[PDB]
Amino acid sequence: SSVQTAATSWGTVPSIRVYTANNGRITERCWDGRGWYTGAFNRPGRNVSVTSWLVGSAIHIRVYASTGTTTTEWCWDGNGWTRGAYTATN
Amino acid sequence: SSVQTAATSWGTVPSIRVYTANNGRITERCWDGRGWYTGAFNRPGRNVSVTSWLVGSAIHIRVYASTGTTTTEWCWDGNGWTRGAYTATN
Amino acid sequence: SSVQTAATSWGTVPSIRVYTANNGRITERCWDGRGWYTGAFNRPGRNVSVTSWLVGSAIHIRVYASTGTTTTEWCWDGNGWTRGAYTATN
Known part of the structure; x- marks a missing residue:
């Protein structure tokens, strides 16, 4: 019924990353203190x-x-973004 | 099928804020070490x-x-709560 | 339409905990730098x-x-996991 988001931040500027799942894909918007921009992350989900x-x-x-x-x-x-070792079950 | 929540915390007391989306609105519950109370944040979503x-x-x-x-x-x-510069696209 | 997850991390190893809600239950997967394992947390939700x-x-x-x-x-x-004082309303 809406997009779904997730956020993280670091440092004192700060840097912020907001991930949005919408229409089958997860994209990324970035703040480093100078304006919002689109990040490299782009995956299905x-x-x-x-x-x-x-x-x-x-x-x-x-x-x-x-x-x-x-x-x-x-x-x-x-x-760059790399695949992690995470699995839901082992 | 349920409410949806988001949480953050800081310091060593700690302070905690839990945001809950339910029935069209997002409300806030706050912990500062002395009991849970309702926060000022209240927005649609x-x-x-x-x-x-x-x-x-x-x-x-x-x-x-x-x-x-x-x-x-x-x-x-x-x-107070203020509108941020974030946009999903530019 | 998918599982729903939540994540936290700490320290510089780091330790990571990923919580997944799926099929009526929330389970936990843990990273302490030596491989992913299933954690003790298991609750309905x-x-x-x-x-x-x-x-x-x-x-x-x-x-x-x-x-x-x-x-x-x-x-x-x-x-161990214990019930917290949190309530959505008071």
């Missing part, structure tokens, strides 16, 4: 959650994107 | 997410409230 | 949110689990 943490100055992001079938973890560790 | 960060002692909160139409960012920076 | 904070080295987690009827707060403070 109907539901999203996110968490992040800093290691010094470097941000690490984990996005849990769920399609009708599968929850996939996507990792940002400074050099 | 079916989906909510939240993030927050501290600048020293001062809390800054961003709530992303999504109606059927629109995702609106609401800002708490110590002196 | 259709929607979940989570927040956590550290007090020194000790993690404190709050999970807001919502069934069709009720939002219940579940607390992890180092010695």
